[PDB]
RNA sequence: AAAACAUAGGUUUGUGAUGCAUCCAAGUGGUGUAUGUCGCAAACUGAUUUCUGCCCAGUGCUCUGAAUGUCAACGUGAGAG
RNA sequence: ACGGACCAAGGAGUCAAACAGACGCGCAAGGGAGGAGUAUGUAUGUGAGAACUCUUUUCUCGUACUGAAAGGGAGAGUGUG
RNA sequence: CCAAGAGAGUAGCACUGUUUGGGAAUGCAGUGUCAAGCCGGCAGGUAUUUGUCUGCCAAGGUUAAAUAUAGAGUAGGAAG
RNA sequence: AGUCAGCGGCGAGCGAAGAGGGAUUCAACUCGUUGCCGAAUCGGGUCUUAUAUGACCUCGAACUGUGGCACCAUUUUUGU
């Protein structure tokens, strides 16, 4: 939720010969001070965190959905475009290749 | 920054509550939603596996249901009509032990509403299997025939018992205004109607002037 | 998506094409709705004219599905019409039938000039209509 | 009350203009036992006679009620009305307690 | 039904007859600790009315609150802030005086539940309540399967929930649709719920 | 670190307990005060010495002063409302 | 004038509503469901937010506008008399 | 031969505050004040009286299931 | 419906309900004011019975617990 984010940390400002940021508050841990909170930091945030809503979905026109498919329907047997997809048969005949139903129940 | 003519300052997902590095907080997304439809149907199915024996829906009454938008149309609403079900005949508590609702809160506002409503009724019940029980005799209500059903597994949708709609149709017609409507005037005049209504009503015209005018 | 957006084209470019007068770092100068009369004036009277100060009148806890729409115009409904209709009825001698509510509505306003008399069982018309559905010797019914 | 219940409206005939949306068909309603309420269901009167009686008056009650014994009868529109609140309550209190001194003086 | 009786007695409040009732419970209280159990209601009625039935489990208490109203406390009585909230007796304390009143009995022992509580008097300082409070422990209580539902997790307090039908008059409750609004998710949920985010499951 | 303050010394108010002074979220809370004008509180002045003028218009303060200008609620009587 | 001793690894224009254009993209006065819900096996599963959908009811926005209103309201066809 | 047994310092009102998108008041809380012939009571989003007409019948009392989990939740899966 | 509800330096900024579709649901419930009453019909205890029940005290309980009835009814009403 808040990752990276996490010391009690303050910015140190100006005067101090260094650029202005978020330091690391206590002493020892030799985190002592080291840059805070952001993106740049070390473990810290990124820039930009990583948003729940992305639109990670969508609509699709129905008729369109369906109508894409459509096309790639008749296009599954374009067979020069079957044959392109990789597919393959030396056995190609009939295109489609069209088969009993009964090889339905071989088991 | 880039020039485009698109269609003038926007875009929103940047303003209040999207918890940020700071926490907060009012969330309710839908994704549990693959999950919640089946939470709904896997629930749904299996439920209905239990119930066994039992037709799931429970009757209700059909309606015409409010508003103008809704003035012209029924539904199949809440509830019953207690003096829908008297006047089919049969007593409300019995009638929940059925599992055909009852209300109160009907009002009951027209006379239609019986009528269509005893005949669905009565159909649930010409659909009617009822259980008995053995040793017992069947004989309460007349609970009917062991292997009838079946009562268990098709749960039951009462729509099959007691459909929905019902509406009245109307056809071609060679005529009518030949007798009569070709003179009817509704270049305002069957405007009339309202107008009189509007214009004599409380702080209108009609009532305070003329009556003013009077004495 | 992400290989489209400019800043993949305005890198290694400091101001992201902002200008590089105008460091105009990342606050509004300006800020929301507001400051439009000081130094927005210009545009909001222009592109916004009408706005403010409240005038007319009102009525409050109005409950809109009560005036929920009901118009349409003539043409329109034969078109919804059965066509076999549409191209028959003319002569007065077959008034089809027409229930403006499965149509949605419930006023007629007038407009159109048909293709055959019917029966439009309608709510509510224009003036017009005593001369367009009568003068057609079309119809209508006024719900009751 | 039952004078706001029976026979009721037989409503006509068409849409708008004085009449609307379908003759109806008025059903049977109301037979709405809850006009029960009160009436004078005699026990009420009773008891709350009794007591009242019992109790005696309110020192307002009497106010007002010197006022009437007087006449200052546009008054009391002040202590009816700021003292009950409402209207109504007024009336109320007026009956009240004018009733109850002018039998009681018999 | 003596309580019929009883009832419209007791609406006579305003009067010397009462008062004198009124006056020896407000010398009495007045002599008096601050909580007490009762052996018995001073107010019956009411009692019986929000339920009191006579048995065990059954618990009365009379419970003495001081009225008034409040200051906001602040230390010494200044804020800082902007104007608004301001005023020594300012925000002006939207629970109610019953509520804190039960409520208090809630906190005030390691069991009881507030079955209900009236107003008994006021005086010019305390205000007393009859509290209905009732152990969930007694065997033929628990016995009482009517009651029983008193027993439950639930029941863990619920006057500080809010539970008691004044304590939900502050809390609110008022089924007229266009007058009990809001609050009918409680004040919260509701909000939570109004002020929702953008959920769409697509877009 | 003094020419500063403290300081004895100078001067006035306020003030006698159902009080004064005073602290306090509140309470039968606090402190001065386990006390009572040789008292307390409050401020000013700054050894001794010696003196300390004029102004009360102003501006405060004070007043037990006046009494009928004013000054809130508050009441009070007055119209279908 | 500032910043800039050195080298690794870091290190900054994001997601996203209505909305304007542009463009592809669907269908067209309709269109977009849309919420849901059903639904039957591939067989883990299944009777696929996401598979396939599939949809009666339609819902919703769209396919006249004008008036504060009360309210009205477009071939004032064209033509014609 | 008839009965006909429904919640008060509460409701209400003022007042104050607070609070509400709720508007001549959405609530609440305090304080004061403080209701029912029961031709009643409550509601019917412009103040009022005034009258109808329209909807209910408060002020005690209990009540799955469908929902949540939102950051710190615990048993046992599924994942990206 | 971010709306013709609307609030709002009325600006900023804010801002809802009803219905519909719909999910989920065979969900609904008590007391206090009705003659309830041939040693409280109760409860606690006890003791039986293998629990109630039986039983008996206790003594909680006639300041009223039971049962019955609960403004939808009971048939309103009258067929008493």
Redesign the interface.
């Given at each position: 939720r808040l990752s990276g984010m996490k010391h009690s940390a303050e910015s140190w400002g100006t005067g101090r010969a260094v650029a202005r940021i978020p330091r690391i508050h206590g002493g020892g841990t030799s985190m002592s001070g080291a840059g805070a909170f952001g993106n740049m930091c070390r473990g810290g945030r990124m820039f930009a965190p990583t948003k729940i809503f992305r639109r990670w979905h969508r609509k699709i026109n129905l008729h369109q959905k369906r109508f894409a498919v459509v096309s790639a329907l008749a296009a599954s047997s374009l067979p020069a475009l079957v044959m392109s997809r990789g597919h393959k048969i030396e056995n190609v005949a009939e295109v489609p290749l069209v088969v009993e139903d009964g090889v339905r129940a071989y088991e | 920054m880039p020039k485009g003519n698109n269609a003038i300052p926007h875009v929103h997902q940047r303003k209040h509550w999207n918890p940020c590095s700071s926490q907060k907080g009012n969330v309710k997304v839908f994704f549990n939603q693959p999950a919640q439809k089946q939470r709904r149907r896997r629930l749904r199915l299996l439920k209905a596996k239990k119930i066994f024996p039992r037709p799931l829906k429970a009757l209700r009454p059909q309606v015409n249901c409010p508003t103008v938008r809704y003035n012209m149309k029924r539904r199949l609403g809440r509830g019953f009509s207690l003096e829908e079900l008297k006047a089919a005949g049969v007593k409300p508590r019995y009638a929940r032990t059925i599992g055909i609702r009852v209300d109160r809160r009907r009002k009951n506002k027209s006379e239609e509403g019986m009528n269509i409503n005893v005949q669905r009724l009565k159909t649930y019940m010409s659909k009617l299997v009822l259980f008995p029980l053995n040793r017992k005799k069947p004989q309460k209500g007349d609970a009917t025939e062991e292997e009838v059903k079946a009562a268990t597994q098709d749960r039951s949708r009462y729509g099959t018992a007691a459909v929905g709609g019902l509406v009245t149709p109307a056809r071609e017609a060679p005529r009518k205004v030949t007798e009569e409507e070709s003179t009817k005037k509704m270049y305002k005049f069957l405007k009339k109607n309202h107008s009189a209504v509007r214009f004599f009503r409380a702080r209108n015209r009609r009532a305070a002037r003329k009556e003013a005018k009077e004495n | 998506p992400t290989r489209f957006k400019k800043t993949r084209h305005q890198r290694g470019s400091t101001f992201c094409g902002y200008g590089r007068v105008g460091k105009h770092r990342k606050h509004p100068s300006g800020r929301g709705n507001a400051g439009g009369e000081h130094h927005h004036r210009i545009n909001f009277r222009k592109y916004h004219p009408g706005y403010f100060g409240k005038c007319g009148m009102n009525h409050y806890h109005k409950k809109k599905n009560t005036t929920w729409k009901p118009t349409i115009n003539l043409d329109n409904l034969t078109k919804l019409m059965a066509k076999d209709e549409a191209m028959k009825a003319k002569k007065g001698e077959a008034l089809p039938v027409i229930d403006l509510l499965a149509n949605g509505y419930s006023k007629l306003l007038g407009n159109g000039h048909l293709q055959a008399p019917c029966i439009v069982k309608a709510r509510w018309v224009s003036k017009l209509a005593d001369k367009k559905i009568r003068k057609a010797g079309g119809a209508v019914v006024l719900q009751a | 009350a039952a004078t706001k219940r029976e026979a009721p409206v037989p409503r006509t005939?068409?849409?708008?203009?004085?009449n609307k949306?379908?003759?109806?068909?008025?059903?049977?309603?109301?037979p709405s036992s809850n006009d029960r309420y009160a009436l004078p269901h005699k026990?009420l009167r009773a008891?709350?006679a009794?007591?009242?009686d019992?109790?005696?008056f309110?020192p307002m009650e009497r106010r007002v009620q010197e006022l009437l014994r007087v006449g200052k009868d546009k008054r009391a529109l002040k202590f009816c009305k700021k003292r009950l609140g409402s209207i109504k309550a007024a009336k109320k209190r007026r009956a009240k307690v004018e009733e109850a001194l002018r039998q009681q003086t018999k | 039904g003596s309580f019929m009786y009883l009832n419209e007695l007791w609406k006579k409040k305003s009067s010397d007859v009462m008062r004198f009732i009124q006056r020896v419970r407000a010398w009495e209280f007045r002599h008096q600790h601050t909580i007490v159990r009762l052996r018995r209601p001073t107010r019956p009625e009411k009692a019986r009315m929000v339920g009191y039935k006579t048995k065990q489990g059954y618990v009365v208490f009379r419970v003495r609150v001081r009225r008034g109203g409040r200051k906001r406390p602040v230390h010494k009585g200044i804020t800082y802030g902007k104007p608004n909230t301001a005023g020594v007796l300012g925000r002006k304390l939207n629970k109610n005086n019953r509520v804190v009143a039960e409520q208090r009995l809630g906190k005030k022992y390691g069991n009881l539940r507030v079955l209900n509580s009236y107003w008994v008097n006021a005086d010019s300082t305390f205000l007393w309540y009859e509290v209905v409070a009732v152990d969930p422990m007694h065997r033929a209580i628990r016995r009482d399967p009517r009651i029983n539902w008193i027993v439950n997790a639930v029941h863990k307090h619920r006057e500080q929930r809010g539970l008691t039908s004044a304590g939900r008059k502050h809390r609110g409750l008022r089924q007229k649709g266009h007058k009990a609004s809001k609050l009918r998710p409680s004040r919260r949920a509701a909000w939570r719920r109004n002020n929702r985010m953008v959920f769409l499951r697509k877009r």
């Open positions: - | - | - | 005939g068409i849409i708008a203009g004085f949306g379908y003759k109806t068909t008025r059903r049977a309603r109301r026990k008891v709350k009794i007591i009242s019992l109790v005696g309110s | -």
